[PDB]
Amino acid sequence: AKVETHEFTAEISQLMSLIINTVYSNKEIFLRELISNASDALDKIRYQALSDPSQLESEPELFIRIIPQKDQKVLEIRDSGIGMTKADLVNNLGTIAKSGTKSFMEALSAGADVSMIGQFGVGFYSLFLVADHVQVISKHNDDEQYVWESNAGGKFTVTLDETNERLGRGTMLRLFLKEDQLEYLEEKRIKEVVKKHSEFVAYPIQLVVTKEVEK
Ligand SMILES: Nc1nc2sc(CNC3CCN(C[C@@](O)(Cn4cncn4)c4ccc(F)cc4F)CC3)cc2n(-c2ccc3c(c2)N(c2ccccc2)CCO3)c1=O
Ligand SMILES: [Mg+2]
Secondary structure, X not given: OXXXXXXXXXXXXXXXXXXXXXOOOOOOHHHHHHHHHHHHHHHHXXXXXXXXXXXXXXXXXXXXXXEEEHHHOEEEEEEOOOOOOHHHHHOOOOOOHHHHHHHHHHHXXXXXXXXXXXXXXXXXXXXXXXXEEEEXXXXXXXXXXXXXXXXXXXXXXXXXXXXXXXXXXXXXXXXXXXXXXXXXXXXXXXXXXXXXXXXXXXXXXXXXXXXXXXX
16 A cells, blocks of 8 residues: 555666657657567567467457556557556566666667667657656556656656556556657557557457547
8 A cells, every 4th residue: 555666676667768858750669569568568568378278268359458648648558468466567677678778778879760679679768759757557467556756757656556557567668658659549540650660469459449429
C-alpha cells in the first residue's frame, strides 16, 4: 500500500530529459516502439506457454489493445504479455537499458535519427516524445499487480495496484499526453500510424473506440 520511491540511474534520467524536450518532427514513431515492446512481451508468454499451457490461464487471449481516454487526455497501450513483477519494475536499474541508453545518446550526438531508438533497445523511452508522464501497470503470473510511475525526472514510484482494472496478465502503459499531442487520441490518426509502422505484428492490434449512439 506504501508508495516506494526509487532513483533512476543517471544515464536513464539523462535520456528521458533529452527525449521529453526534443523537437524531433516524427513523434508518431513512439507507437511503433510501444507496439514492438508489447509484441516482444507476448512472445515471451507464448514461449512459456508452449512448455506449460497453464501459464495462459491468467488471461487466455493474446492481444495488443490501444484505448484512447479522451476526457483524461490519456492514451493506454495494453498487452497480455508476460508482464513484470514488482522486482522487474524496480529493476530498470541494473538492466541492459543502462547500456542501450548511453550508446544511444552518443549516437544522437553523432547525428542519429531519434527513430533509431529501438535499435539500442530503449524504444520504451520514446513515449516521452508525446507524453509528459506515464504509469506502467503490470501483472506477472508470479506477483500481484503493480503500478510504476515516472515524469521523466530522476525519481519513479512503485505502488501495489489497488486502483486500476485487473489486467489478468500483462502490461498497460498509460500515457498522459502533452497538450499539443492530442491527435493520438483520434481513431483515424491511430489507424494511420499503426498501418504505416506496425504492418508486421503477430498479435491482433485492437483499437477501442467510444462513439455516441445517435438517432
Ligand atoms: N509492454 C511491456 N511488457 C514488458 S514484459 C517485460 C519483461 N522483461 C523482463 C526483464 C528481465 N528478464 C530477465 C532475463 O530473462 C533477461 N535475460 C535473459 N537472458 C539474458 N538476460 C533473465 C533471466 C534469468 C536470469 F538469471 C537473468 C536475467 F536477466 C525477464 C523479462 C518488459 C516489458 N516491457 C518493457 C520493454 C522494454 C523496456 C522496459 C519494459 N522498461 C521498463 C521497466 C520497468 C518499468 C518501466 C519500463 C525499460 C526499458 O525497456 C514492456 O514495455
Ligand atoms: Mg511462475
